[PDB]
Amino acid sequence: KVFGRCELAAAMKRHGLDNYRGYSLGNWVCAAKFESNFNTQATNRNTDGSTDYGILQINSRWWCNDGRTPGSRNLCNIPCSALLSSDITASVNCAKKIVSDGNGMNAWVAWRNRCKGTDVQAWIRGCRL
Ligand code: NA
């Protein structure tokens, strides 16, 4: 599924991401834009051989099981394929554990490089929330 901007904003809000760990909804929509372009089926291979899955590009190195990332963990206790679903529940549940891990949204390097400190409120501008 390719979400619309306000569509994803509404789905993240319903799943309790708005201001989760103090991160306004626009931070989460910004991160999704640059991680996945709002495509739930997005997958990208890392140099270390781990893969990033779904709207928030959650890494098989720690958070999900894909069966092909040696010495990795599955801290969200999910198959990585669950992060590609048109239903974002699994991605949002796992993102709550990642952002709780001590470094907030800096875990998403594209958030740090492209969203952090910017006018993230613009990402939810005009959305009926
Ligand atoms: Na893993």
Write the DSSP string, 93-126: HHHHHHHTSSSGGGGSHHHHHHTTTS-GGGGGTT
Catalytic residue among 7, 18, 48, 52: 52
Rounded to whole angstroms, the Cα distance separating 56 from 35 reads: 6
**Phi, psi for residue 97 in degrees, rounded to 5:** -70, -40
Confirm whether 7 is a catalytic residue. no
Rounded to whole angstroms, the Cα distance separating 127 from 73 reads: 37
Task: For residue 72, report the distance from its CA to the centre of ligand 1, in Å.
Answer: 4
Query: Could you give all domains of the chain from N- to C-terminal order, each with its CATH number?
Result: 1-129 (1.10.530.10)
CB 105 within 8 A of CB 61: no
Residue 41 burial (C-beta neighbours within 10 Å; 0-12, 13-18, 19+): middle
Experimental method: X-ray
Q: How far is CA 28 from CA 60, 73, 91, 101, 104, in A?
A: 20, 24, 12, 16, 12
C-alpha distance across the termini of the chain, in Å: 20
What sign has the CA pseudo-torsion 114, 102, 67, 88?
Answer: negative
Q: How far is CA 18 from CA 13, 50, 108, 113, in A?
A: 5, 29, 17, 21
Task: For residue 79, report the distance from its CA to the centre of ligand 1, in Å.
Answer: 8
